[PDB]
Amino acid sequence: GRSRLLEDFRNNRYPNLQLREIAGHIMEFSQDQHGSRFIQLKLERATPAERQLVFNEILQAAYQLMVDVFGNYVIQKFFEFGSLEQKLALAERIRGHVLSLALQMYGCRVIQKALEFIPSDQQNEMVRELDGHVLKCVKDQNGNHVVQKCIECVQPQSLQFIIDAFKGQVFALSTHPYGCRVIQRILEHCLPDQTLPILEELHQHTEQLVQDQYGNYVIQHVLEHGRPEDKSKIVAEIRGNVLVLSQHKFASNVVEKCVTHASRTERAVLIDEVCTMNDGPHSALYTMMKDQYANYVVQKMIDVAEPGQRKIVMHKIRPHIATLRKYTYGKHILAKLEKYY
RNA sequence: UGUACAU
């Protein structure tokens, strides 16, 4: 049901098509793959009057265009380049529909863009609509990116309804594919009194989390961007378990970020842990230097260890070379010790 | 030689 105008334009029949030569058709073009691209382009170089021409027609049809696979890009354009009046006018069209848009495949894309370009007042009005549906949104493949975007953009003081919805759902959520992403945002952007309760739960479950395909990513975040005190609780939980955890697909990564991001003393106490303590009938370092994952840990110890501790490790390894040569994951550990002596 | 985000 494409107008002859759209058809002809979609078939190279208007190399000089001007913005004003499509008035009456602004929706039609917005829902087309080429039409939508055309509009967006001419819109950058557009005059104030031209841009109003187009706004008149997209405002009229705003919600439809928001949940459209092409229309949404046209709308996002106005949040970026439109005037303050055009932005507030679009955000007003959204009022009432924040949640259904956030769960919508294309709608969430608009929300994310609106959140990034409307004034705090309108941001705060928009976010309020999510209260009551915080976990529905987070566990959703679209919503989760809105929530993520809320945390990045809105005053933290406005996001307490979220922190309150995470109470008792920190672990369950850090083991969620989307949940874990949102936990990271919160840790990055939220206020001290908000991150406290999150970190409380995080610590109570550090053991389970470090071995979880998503959880482990959250612990790594804390070891990379977190407060020293928090780091130490994590490493206090890795300390002693260094051998077992380094042989794990997921947790082996945590152990590297402990070796890497702990204090100078803690770092030295973790490296010594594998050099001393032994494994059943074999030595710890021995087991690790040939394991498919743990071998990476070893190399990461060789790195962050100050020359003193690094000589003892090189020395501790030197005897097992021939065994190392026989195992495939011992190759890159060999590479390192070979460059040494 | 080893793990996660959508038009």
Swiss-Prot record:
Residues 144-148 are annotated as: Non-specific-nucleotide binding in RNA target. Expressed in brain, heart, kidney, muscle, intestine and stomach. Not expressed in cerebellum, corpus callosum, caudate nucleus, hippocampus, medulla oblongata and putamen. Expressed in all fetal tissues tested. It is found in: Cytoplasm; Cytoplasm, P-body; Cytoplasmic granule. Residues 72-76, 216-220, 295-299 are annotated as: Uracil-nucleotide binding in RNA target. Induction: Strongly down-regulated in keratinocytes upon UVB irradiation. It comes from the Eukaryota. The pumilio repeats mediate the association with RNA by packing together to form a right-handed superhelix that approximates a half donut. RNA-binding occurs on the concave side of the surface. PUM1 is composed of 8 pumilio repeats of 36 residues; each repeat binds a single nucleotide in its RNA target. Residues at positions 12 and 16 of the pumilio repeat bind each RNA base via hydrogen bonding or van der Waals contacts with the Watson-Crick edge, while the amino acid at position 13 makes a stacking interaction. Disulfide bonds: none annotated. Pumilio repeats lie at residues 21-56, 57-92, 93-128, 129-164, 165-200, 201-236, 237-272, 276-315. Residues 252-256 are annotated as: Guanine-nucleotide binding in RNA target. Sequence-specific RNA-binding protein that acts as a post-transcriptional repressor by binding the 3'-UTR of mRNA targets. Binds to an RNA consensus sequence, the Pumilio Response Element (PRE), 5'-UGUANAUA-3', that is related to the Nanos Response Element (NRE). Mediates post-transcriptional repression of transcripts via different mechanisms: acts via direct recruitment of the CCR4-POP2-NOT deadenylase leading to translational inhibition and mRNA degradation. Also mediates deadenylation-independent repression by promoting accessibility of miRNAs. Changing residue 220 to E: Changes the specificity for RNA. Recruits the CCR4-POP2-NOT deadenylase leading to translational inhibition and mRNA degradation. In case of viral infection, interacts with DHX58. Interacts with TRIM71 (via NHL repeats) in an RNA-dependent manner. This is Pumilio homolog 1. The gene is PUM1. Residues 1-341 form the PUM-HD domain. Residues 36-40, 108-112, 180-184 are annotated as: Adenine-nucleotide binding in RNA target. Changing residue 310 to W: In SCA47; decreased post-transcriptional repression of E2F3 and ATXN1. It is linked to Spinocerebellar ataxia 47: A form of spinocerebellar ataxia, a clinically and genetically heterogeneous group of cerebellar disorders. Patients show progressive incoordination of gait and often poor coordination of hands, speech and eye movements, due to degeneration of the cerebellum with variable involvement of the brainstem and spinal cord. SCA47 is an autosomal dominant disease with a highly variable phenotype and incomplete penetrance. Clinical features include developmental disability, ataxia, and seizures.
